[PDB]
């Protein structure tokens, strides 16, 4: 085999900023979500969970876009990046041609995500 | 044919660890291996103690996430021995893999990242 | 055979500390930023952007240094530049360097992964 790292991305998001944005323009904020992510979001009852979810998605989607690079990836629509967790709780994103590695974390005030994209060299 | 087995990241609020340690010091110290406990027991400043604990929480959590095993295999925090190379670069050994670790902290936050790489052999 | 990871590094910086650095000791900037980075820093007209830039670069150099390990590089010899899409980049003989930077109002962070060169 001939694996190689294509690119990496990291993003840190201040949860309070996302709280403010969501209170002001909830529908505009929700446009970053895919249909699957929207379905999940619509089942939440509590605002704290809603904001954590959104903040985490902002962070992951940005980290992924940065890792991909290319004009194509820099300009990927956030609502076309479907983030999910596997049956073991590992965050994932499917993207043809790459093995996408993701990791997430959050605290009360911050959400952070990192992405590493690997590729076969040929 | 991946070269990377998994990655993990964790961010920890130091103040939360301060609170936890003040309330349940013994429970908190149980996250440490015997080797880590030996290091901890030599510290004389509280600030260093809390930073050490916060950094270990972050690193152990990042490592756990990089494993990608969910609730499928039980790994105790006191079975993840974070140590230093002779210059202080953080390390963790995990048979079958090459483990890469990096740690950073500020006054209020500790973070850690772990990458588990596939071994050639 | 697969490429190999030489090392990884991460760094988190509180922007207020960097604000204090610049205000109290602007000439320290010369020991941190490369000539190319200094050219960019000197052209900012908005102080908030200027401090964010410096914080991000400081974080990047610390992350790079951690990734390289010591088995030695001056901060003002580690040039992080950006490509035509904005992506931060560092060129360093013997390695493929991967870099990512992120900022919030109060924090800057950077991560670096050094991969071993072959082809
Ligand atoms: Cl933010
Ligand atoms: Cl709206
Ligand atoms: Cl909920
Ligand atoms: Cl979720
Ligand atoms: Cl926390
Ligand atoms: Cl106790
Ligand atoms: Cl001490
Ligand atoms: Cl800091
Ligand atoms: Cl400006
Ligand atoms: Cl340039
Ligand atoms: Cl970036
Ligand atoms: Cl950013
Ligand atoms: Ni594996």
Residue A91 bridge partners (DSSP): A85
Q: Indicate yes or no: CB of C106 within 8 angstroms of CB of A14.
A: yes
Q: What separation, in Å, do the N-terminal and C-terminal C-alpha atoms of chain C show?
A: 11
Under DSSP, the state recorded for A88 is T
- Are C114 and C100 contacting, i.e. CB atoms less than 8 angstroms apart? no
Which positions of C are annotated as active-site residues? 66, 103
Residues on chain B touching A64 (C-beta within 8 angstroms): none
What separation in angstroms does the CA of B57 have from each of B27, C5, C62? 13, 25, 22
Place of tokens 């079958």: B96
Place of tokens 């895919």: A34
**How far is Cα A92 from Cα A100, in angstroms, rounded to an integer?**
7
C-facing residues of A in 85-114 (CB < 8 A) are 110, 112, 114
Residue A115 bridge partners (DSSP): A9, A102
Residues 6+ apart with CB under 8 A from C20: none
CA C104 to chain centre: 16
How are strands ordered across the β-sheet holding A3-14?
Answer: A3-14, A110-120, A99-106
**How far is Cα B15 from Cα B51, in angstroms, rounded to an integer?**
10
Residues 6+ apart with CB under 8 A from B90: B59, B82, B83, B84, B101, B102, B103, B112
- Are A93 and A100 contacting, i.e. CB atoms less than 8 angstroms apart? yes
Residue B100 is nearest to which of C7, C62, C70, comparing CB atoms? C7
Give me the phi and psi of B49, to 5 degrees please: -60, -50
Closest approach of chain C CAs to the CA of A7, in angstroms?
A: 6
Q: Chain B residue with minimal CA distance to C109?
A: B104
Residues 6+ apart with CB under 8 A from A105: A111, A112, A113, B9, B10, B11, B61, B62, B111
Q: Which chains touch A (3 or more CB pairs under 8 A)?
A: B, C
**Is B58 within 8 Å of chain C by CB?**
no
Q: Which ligand is nearest to the CA of B23?
A: 6
Nearest CA-CA partner of C63 in C19, C97, C14, C17: C97
Resolution (A): 1.8
Ligand 5 centre to CA of B52 (Å) is 14
Q: Chain A residue with minimal CA distance to B8?
A: A103
- Are C111 and A5 contacting, i.e. CB atoms less than 8 angstroms apart? no
**How far is Cα A85 from Cα B52, in angstroms, rounded to an integer?**
30
Residues on chain A touching B8 (C-beta within 8 angstroms): 103
**B74 is annotated as an active-site residue:** no
Residue B3 is nearest to which of C2, C12, C109, comparing CB atoms? C2
Q: Indicate yes or no: CB of A101 within 8 angstroms of CB of B6.
A: yes
What chain C holds in terms of domains, given with CATH numbers, is 3-119 (3.90.470.20)
Q: How many CB pairs under 8 A join A and C?
A: 61
Residues on chain C touching A12 (C-beta within 8 angstroms): 102-104, 107, 109
* Residue A84 CB neighbours (<10 A): 14
């Amino acid at each position: 085999s001939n694996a190689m790292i294509h690119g990496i991305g990291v993003d840190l998001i201040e949860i309070d900023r996302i709280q403010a944005l969501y209170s002001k323009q909830p529908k505009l904020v929700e446009r970053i979500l895919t249909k699957n992510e929207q379905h999940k979001f619509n089942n939440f009852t509590h605002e704290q969970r809603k904001i954590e979810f959104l903040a985490g998605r902002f962070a992951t989607k940005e980290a992924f876009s940065k890792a991909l690079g290319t004009g194509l990836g820099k300009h990927v629509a956030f609502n076309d990046i479907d983030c999910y967790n596997d049956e073991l709780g590992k965050p994932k994103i499917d993207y043809e041609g790459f093995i996408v590695h993701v990791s997430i974390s959050h605290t009360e005030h911050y959400a952070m995500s990192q992405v590493v994209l690997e590729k076969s060299a040929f």
